[PDB]
């Protein structure tokens, strides 16, 4: 009952959750790495590696990996974030060991053929071109760049085209040698899984991994805490039909004691879409204002992003480049945050938000894959897994007061950073935002 844990001699942590009445499972290897472990010339390597890890290992050619997974009915996948590198598999319980084997093989014994490395440069460029058509993604990459100015967290995951064209097999092997240490990784499993056996297979297939020489427990401080830099970037682009704005303030990290309170406050502001509404039976004064007299925007979305040592909390706005005065929708958002700071919120909306939050965090923990995802990410970024019942408790105890407290701390006399893409002439300044907000 709950999540069993074990540490291998090289530092690797094995976290598992057995699911009764199942015959399948998910296993995944999580590494504290990602793009935040790269430098300016290095930037884009982790993602590049993710494409290559499927092109062949010292034990299996590309087509050999695919064909093997397909024959037993398993699934192989992976992703790179600013904080982690993750590879995972889904399979019938009989194939779990075959899965751990293949995961270790793909993560640590990848061939990295020079021909492959060149053919892929093109795939990544294509990839980057497509992301450029996703205005929300673009706005958020820029926001990260100016908010975490000249810091690791401020860099994108794909990296600049310049680096995508210059990354060498050396860069790749270097990144691997530097970051893949047992004390920086978690092997997480859920479903029809035997914790003891999974630990053995872990040692067998992952035991060869180098321990860092200066080991640090999974959730302990990397080094100097990222620092939130106030800033603004107006990216004028008069050809876009819609204008996209992101406004942020220093948020909360995964382990912050006020983590859930931050999410609860995000839920109290919520989202809105000009066509769909709020997704709630009763709209906040903000949602009502946004929809009034012709509408003030096309939509707005509250967001909270967390990292092991930092976080961003704010609003993402999409407006009609020809019909909306962005300044009007921004006034309303600030007014709403000030409403929270002033305590003018009902018990009902606070309980509505807690219910929404509980649902989003717990009812979504359905299959083994979502559960492995929660186990792996929590342990690799925090060093532990709060159980569904512990998370429920953390949300259930939140009070109207905790929220008011939290907003007055995080949204009063604090720096803000902002990015705008499209028709920028109607977009207000960052000092404008801070004036009205702190006012």
């Amino acid at each position: 009952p709950g999540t069993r844990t074990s540490k291998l001699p090289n530092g690797l942590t094995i976290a598992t959750e057995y699911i009764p009445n199942t015959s399948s499972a998910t296993v995944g290897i999580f590494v504290d790495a990602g793009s935040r472990a790269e430098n300016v010339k290095n930037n884009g390597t982790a993602h590049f590696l993710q494409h290559l890890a499927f092109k062949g290992t010292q034990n299996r050619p590309q087509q050999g990996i695919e064909l093997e997974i397909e024959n037993i009915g398993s699934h192989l996948n992976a992703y790179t974030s600013r904080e982690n590198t993750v590879y995972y598999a889904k399979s019938l319980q009989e194939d779990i060991p075959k899965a751990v084997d293949i995961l270790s093989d793909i993560l640590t014994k990848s061939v990295l053929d020079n021909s492959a490395i060149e053919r892929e440069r093109d795939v990544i460029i294509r990839e980057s071109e497509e992301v450029d058509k996703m205005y929300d993604e673009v706005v958020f990459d820029h926001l990260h760049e100016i908010t975490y100015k000249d810091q690791p967290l401020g860099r994108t995951i794909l990296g600049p085209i310049k680096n995508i064209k210059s990354i060498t097999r050396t860069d790749l092997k270097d990144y691997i040698t530097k970051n893949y240490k047992g004390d920086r990784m978690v092997l997480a499993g859920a479903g029809a899984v035997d914790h003891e056996k999974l630990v053995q297979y872990a040692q067998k297939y992952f035991g060869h991994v180098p321990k860092s020489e200066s080991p640090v427990p999974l959730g302990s401080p990397r080094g100097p805490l990222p620092v939130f830099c106030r800033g603004e970037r107006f990216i004028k682009e008069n050809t876009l039909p819609t204008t996209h704005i992101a406004i942020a303030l220093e948020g909360v990290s995964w382990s912050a004691p006020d983590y859930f309170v931050a999410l609860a406050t995000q839920a109290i502001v919520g989202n809105w879409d000009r066509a769909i509404g709020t997704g709630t039976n009763s709209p906040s004064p903000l949602a009502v204002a946004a929809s009034q007299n012709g509408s003030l925007a096309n939509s707005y979305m509250s967001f909270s992003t967390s990292y092991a040592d930092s976080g961003l909390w704010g609003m993402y706005i999409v407006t009609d480049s020809n019909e909306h005065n962005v300044r009007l929708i921004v006034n309303e958002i600030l007014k709403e945050w000030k409403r929270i700071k002033s305590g003018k919120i009902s018990d009902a909306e606070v309980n509505r938000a807690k219910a929404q939050l509980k649902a989003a965090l717990l009812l979504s923990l359905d299959g083994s894959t979502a559960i492995v995802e929660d186990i792996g990410r929590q342990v690799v970024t925090t060093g532990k897994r709060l159980s569904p019942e512990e998370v429920f408790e953390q949300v259930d105890k939140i009070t109207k007061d905790d929220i008011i407290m939290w907003a007055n701390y995080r949204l009063q006399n604090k720096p803000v950073s902002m990015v705008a893409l499209g028709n920028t002439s109607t977009v207000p300044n960052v000092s404008y935002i801070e004036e009205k907000l702190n006012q």
């Binding site: 397909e70 024959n71 037993i72 009915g73 039976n281 009812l363 083994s368």
Partner: protein
């Protein structure tokens, strides 16, 4: 069955109550009604859609606003959906809230108010929804396939309500539909992670005194006819490439038919997809449609095998999307693929193909069942249809015992037009397409040229 911790019983009024699994981090529950577009006939067309869009509005004992708000406080993870053979109300909620959610479900299922305003709202909103559905080929083609496969009756009765019929859906027809189908004997209450004893308590408390209206039994068996149909080419947008589409099928099997596992394996062995297929291994790039079609012809942007299986009939076949220029080759390409599954002594199905397709089938079933909501829906529909829940073990075993000949025998049976379901369907093919009709050529002649289908009854 046994490991499921599956239990089933009935209330005095005929309502079946099914529970399974053991306690967990949260629970799931739902009310399943044996209704759907196949039972609408011409008089109740569109009533299933409107009733499902009216789910959880005001009831006799709960104001609309209070309903909505209490559902939010419960987590908001609920929904009503309907299809050709089902109408279900489902949700997942925290363990302590099962009773409150069952109460709300029973209220909208037994005492909906359906005011003029609520009805006028859903009707207006349905016209817009129908206009959008007709722009999505992924939704339109399957609809045309069914309509022609059964000549617009039962399983082929429109799932998408004709636009011009929406304004005449009155409260009267909605009440007629409810009085015919919403009866305890035509309903199942299922729960996952809730002790059976507790489920009987709550069910008796909210649905126990519900009484039947003893309506006229109007459920017709599906009669597969086969047929053709073609709608005009879709408008050419901006950068998007222009594509023609075609779907070709034959009558398939009922979901409880003995050869259903062999048939699903065949569908997995053909597999296929979009010429893009984004994702890691295990996606099915080694299935025949990828190998013999996508990887061979790119004027083909999509090619996949479908298997619609219902209570008394089904449709099995292949879907293909291609550039207008290739249209003339579409039928033949598809006919060859079907032919090669049983009639080509040199392309017989191999141990490897069948073994892989088998594991992939077991895999998607089991992995999908990892979700409580899916376990719930699967249990509810199974009980609604044949009053029992086939246990997983049995399902797996029947798949593992399959051998190549089994798949070949079933492939031949389907493609030869030799299926004998209760409705005694013709062995004629169903061919439905979007593009200029001329571009596809003599469709019937190509299919006969491959010995597909059945001419003489």
């Amino acid at each position: 069955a046994r490991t499921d911790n599956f239990k089933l019983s009935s209330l005095a009024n005929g309502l079946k109550v099914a529970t399974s699994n053991t306690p967990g981090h949260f629970s799931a529950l739902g009310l399943y009604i044996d209704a759907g577009s196949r039972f609408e006939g011409r008089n109740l067309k569109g009533c299933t859609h409107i009733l499902d869009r009216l789910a959880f509005k005001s009831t006799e004992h709960v104001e609309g606003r209070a309903m909505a708000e209490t559902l939010e406080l419960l987590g908001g993870n609920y929904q009503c959906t309907s299809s050709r053979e089902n109408l279900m109300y489902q949700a997942s909620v925290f363990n302590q809230d099962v009773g409150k959610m069952l109460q709300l479900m029973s209220e909208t299922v037994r005492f909906p108010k359906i005011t003029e305003q609520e009805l006028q709202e859903q009707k207006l909103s349905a016209e817009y929804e129908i206009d959008e559905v007709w722009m999505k080929p992924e939704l339109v083609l399957p609809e045309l396939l069914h309509t022609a496969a059964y000549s617009g009756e039962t399983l082929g009765s429109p799932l998408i309500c004709p636009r011009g019929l929406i304004p005449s859906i009155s409260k009267y027809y909605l009440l007629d539909y409810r009085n015919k189908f919403y009866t305890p004997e035509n309903t199942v209450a299922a729960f996952v992670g809730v002790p059976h004893e507790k489920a009987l308590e709550l069910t008796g408390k909210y649905l126990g005194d519900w009484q039947s209206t003893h309506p006229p039994i109007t459920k017709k068996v599906a009669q597969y006819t086969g047929g053709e149909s073609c709608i005009p080419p879709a408008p050419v947008f901006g950068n998007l490439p222009e594509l023609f589409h075609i779907q070709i099928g034959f009558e398939g099997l009922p979901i409880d038919h003995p050869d259903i596992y062999a048939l699903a394996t065949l569908q997995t062995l053909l597999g296929g997809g979009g010429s893009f297929s984004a994702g890691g291994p295990g996606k099915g790039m080694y299935s025949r449609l990828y190998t013999h079609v996508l990887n061979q012809y790119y004027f083909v942007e999509n090619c996949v095998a479908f298997n619609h299986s219902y209570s008394d009939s089904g449709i099995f076949g292949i879907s293909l999307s291609c550039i207008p220029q290739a249209a003339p080759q579409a039928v033949e390409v598809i006919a060859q693929q079907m032919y090669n599954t049983f009639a080509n002594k040199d392309l017989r199905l191999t141990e490897d193909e069948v073994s892989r397709a088998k594991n992939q089938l077991k895999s998607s079933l089991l992995m999908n069942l990892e979700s409580k909501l899916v376990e719930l829906e699967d249990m509810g529909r199974q009980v609604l249809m044949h009053g029992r829940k086939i246990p997983v073990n049995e399902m797996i075993s029947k798949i593992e015992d399959l051998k190549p000949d089994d798949i070949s025998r079933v492939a031949e049976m389907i493609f030869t037009g030799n299926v004998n379901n209760a409705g005694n369907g013709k062995g004629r093919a169903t061919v439905v397409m979007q593009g200029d009709r001329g571009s596809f050529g003599d469709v019937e002649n190509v299919l006969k040229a491959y010995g597909l289908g059945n001419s003489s009854s």
